[PDB]
Design a protein around this ligand. Structure first.
Ligand SMILES: Nc1ncnc2c1ncn2[C@@H]1O[C@H](COP(=O)(O)OP(=O)(O)O)[C@@H](O)[C@H]1O
Ligand SMILES: Nc1ncnc2c1ncn2[C@@H]1O[C@H](COP(=O)(O)OP(=O)(O)O)[C@@H](O)[C@H]1O
Ligand SMILES: [Mg+2]
Ligand SMILES: [Mg+2]
Ligand SMILES: [Mg+2]
Ligand SMILES: [Mg+2]
Lengths: 465, 465
């Protein structure tokens, strides 16, 4: 079978996805945004694809041919309307006799579903992909699905925002409807300053570059803040009052795979993911039921899902959002590390063979140990005081982890820092700015989690200011 | 315009060809032999092609995806008949709306010409490409063309060889009809040992891996040795009694570009190429006339040509062979370095626009200096005595050029050696075995040539035996 991948940023990381897919399938890669592709990613695409096509419109001089080492967000214009992007995807699938189409990138999810319908291939479903990609549509589907409902309003104007804040009250979440990675996600607690907070992220949002293929009913959604009740869920310290759960939709039925515990965010910037959750079986049953109702509520047919859930009072699961694609960072690789299951291969098996794929009957269990996937940010060193608080730029020499910081049998499997010499702008939104990553493993989850907090508070930044 | 390149070994090197082509054209690359592609070559193909297709039949496990750092000859099977290879090329050109097809590899020249005819694109010409690829057909075309003629016979059997040696006498050249790089090329001078010499290279030839797409009337050609008369041509020492000349056929007319001087071969293994020739204008007029008659005699329509010519008594040019593709090593890059002319771009301009291309009217001149492209071989150190004569293997630590060795204003532009640690088998045919490469430049050609001989005799090999 031949699988077409729409290659771009995010989701199951290139270091796993290409090799995984090429094991069992003939992979063809379509690159709609050549500029979104790093040098490492380009190498992996080249290595494992039997065929590769790039959008030739995004090559005007010989330097369009350059691949950066690192990309946190694609800044260049992509100006094709969604119908045109659909027609491209279709043309490429047809060129290669594709039996399935997949993507790891949030921004191409809606057009891909349209391409699959037109080709008679398995996909998210046209309206379902739109629901999984416009947070106002999504929140409407959730409210209808008999998970916990909350108040939410479409916001374009200061007038819209004013109305929303009056109707919803504080605390209020205001966020863009069409992005990812917590971009623009703001917590409103003060009616005195709320309107300035809006004006500010409004102006910010307009500086974010997205393809014209991305459309939305209103730029913002304002909705109730879902309050966490940590102590109603976790028995030990170390985690946060949200989780994610990774699943697969197959013919419109939800198949849970694994739940990830989290460490506390820096604002809304995510910090760490632990595979699998320490939560008891009843807690996990409730999360699974919520994710099922949410994703079936969206109408999704065949895709991976990454579903985020706030752990609220009375063990009520609150839906934050759900995507029709893989979790990012190393969450999917780490499921393979722990359980032996390759969810990338499993998705492709579903796209090609439906419920003939070997879907697990329930969450994976009998984990031999826990694995943490962790990023450090300028803020861990601002909060450490190693970076002076008022600094807009810095130059990175080294990042070191002092010894002694590990609890129990917790092991550091790997550690990677930003190269000596690297330049960091501190006006930047944090989630774009991890300057180190580490993987921990341990037999005891609470020990793993404590070690993450120790590594976080004590890591050593040597840096020219 | 869209150019399809059949990507494989030899010709205009990847470090020039892809970037050159992608400057002015939309490049699509077809890889019929994934195993023939080095890691550097793969990277260049990926960087400059808007689309890439590989033959998926040559991928059975995840390690078919590996690219070696270095390949001297493709060892793996390629089992498709020529008609099947033609049909592939056609299918790919049709997929991408190719306006032209080119290749740098000798072994795909015949099928490509067939694909171009069928598609109505410019090419070598079907029978002309066959003549440029079967040395018995080639030598027959040459004899007909009114360049100097010589005796030649088709050899398959010991009986055939015996007959050929009687009819031709010594000295005799016996060589495979369908290869390159002097593989199997043998000089016969002794009727006592001639039949054993045949039996030996017969058995050797059968161990050389070529695609099934390569066919030939007889495996061997035996033909008169063309005697050189150096002193009838060159006024100074430093060169050899053969040259090459690089040209372009456009609509069946020959356009000379540049003549390369050579340093003496190690047997028939080539050693160095100097851009451009020091030969006087009359000598160059005779070479050009010979190359014209030869390549027009072959019937070639639209292609690059690399034509090798023995400098014989009475300034008679002897045809050695001619290919319907670029010279290998850095001969084509070095023409650009000296004259500013990019022959890769010029070939593509001819394939797409015919004689509307900006073809020079005669050999390029007003060279600002001479550039030498030079390889060192185990033999330069065997002959130096730095490698003991009876050694079948070695391990390379370093290769050094002592200072003092440069004549006049000759400069070393660049120097590259085999990595410390590299392993070298000395049973191997020499042309496969360069362990260092250097580029010289100088204002005075005879000084450049002398410096090459000094570097050759005195270079320092540090090596574990
Ligand atoms: N209604 C909400 N209540 C509480 N937290 C929220 C809410 N909406 C978003 N968040 C927080 O902001 C983060 C990012 O918002 P999310 O809706 O997941 O958008 P994104 O697609 O940018 O990741 C979430 O992981 C969650 O911590
Ligand atoms: N008839 C010949 N007379 C003299 N030298 C020859 C003859 N044939 C081949 N050679 C020598 O052998 C080398 C390689 O042979 P050639 O015919 O060019 O085949 P290849 O395609 O292997 O390079 C030539 O560069 C030339 O030096
Ligand atoms: Mg999201
Ligand atoms: Mg999210
Ligand atoms: Mg040859
Ligand atoms: Mg030759």
């Amino acid at each position: 079978k031949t699988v077409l991948v729409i290659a771009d940023l995010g989701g199951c990381p290139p270091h796993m996805f290409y090799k995984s897919a090429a094991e069992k399938y003939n992979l063809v890669s379509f690159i709609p945004r050549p500029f979104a592709i790093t040098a490492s990613h380009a190498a992996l695409i080249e290595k494992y694809s039997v065929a590769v096509i790039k959008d030739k419109d995004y090559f005007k001089s010989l330097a369009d041919f350059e691949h950066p080492d690192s990309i946190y967000w694609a800044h260049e214009d992509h100006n094709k309307p969604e119908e045109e992007v659909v027609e491209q995807i279709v043309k490429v699938a047809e060129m290669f006799g594709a039996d399935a189409i997949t993507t790891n990138n949030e921004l191409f999810i809606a057009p891909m579903a349209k391409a699959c319908e037109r080709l008679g291939l398995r996909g998210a479903g046209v309206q379902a992909a739109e629901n999984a990609r416009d947070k106002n549509k999504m929140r409407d589907a959730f409210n209808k699905a008999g998970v916990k409902s909350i108040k939410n309003k479409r916001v374009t104007t200061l007038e819209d925002f004013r109305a929303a804040l009056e109707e919803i009250g504080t605390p209020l979440i205001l966020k863009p409807t069409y992005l990812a990675s917590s971009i623009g996600v703001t917590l409103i607690t003060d009616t005195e300053t709320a309107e300035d907070e809006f004006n500010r992220v409004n102006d910010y949002l307009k500086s974010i570059n997205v393809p014209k293929a991305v459309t939305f009913e209103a730029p913002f959604i304002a909705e109730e803040f879902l309050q966490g009740e940590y102590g109603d869920w976790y028995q030990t310290e170390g985690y946060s009052d949200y989780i994610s759960i990774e699943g697969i939709m197959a013919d419109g039925e939800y198949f849970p795979i694994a739940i990830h515990d989290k460490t506390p965010q820096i604002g809304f910037t995510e910090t760490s993911h632990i595979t699998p959750s320490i939560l008891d079986e009843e807690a996990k049953k409730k999360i699974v039921e919520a994710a099922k109702k949410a994703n079936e509520g969206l109408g999704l047919q065949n895709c991976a899902t990454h579903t985020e859930i706030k752990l609220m009072k009375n063990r009520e699961p609150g839906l934050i959002e759900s995507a029709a694609r893989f979790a990012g960072w190393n969450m999917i690789p780490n499921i393979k590390k722990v359980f032996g299951l390759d969810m990338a291969q499993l998705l492709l098996d579903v796209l090609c063979f439906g419920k003939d794929a070997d879907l697990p009957d329930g969450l994976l269990d009998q984990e031999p140990y826990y694995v943490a996937d962790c990023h450090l940010y300028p803020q861990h060193f601002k909060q450490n005081g190693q970076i002076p608080e008022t600094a807009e730029d810095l130059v990175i020499e080294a990042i070191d982890i002092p010894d002694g910081l590990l609890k129990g049998d917790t092991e550091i499997v790997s550690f990677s820092a930003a190269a000596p010499g690297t330049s960091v702008d501190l006006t930047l939104f944090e989630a774009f700015n991890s300057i180190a990553a580490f993987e921990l493993k341990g037999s005891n989850s609470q020990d793993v989690a404590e070690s993450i907090r120790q590594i976080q508070q004590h890591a050593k930044l040597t840096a020219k200011y």
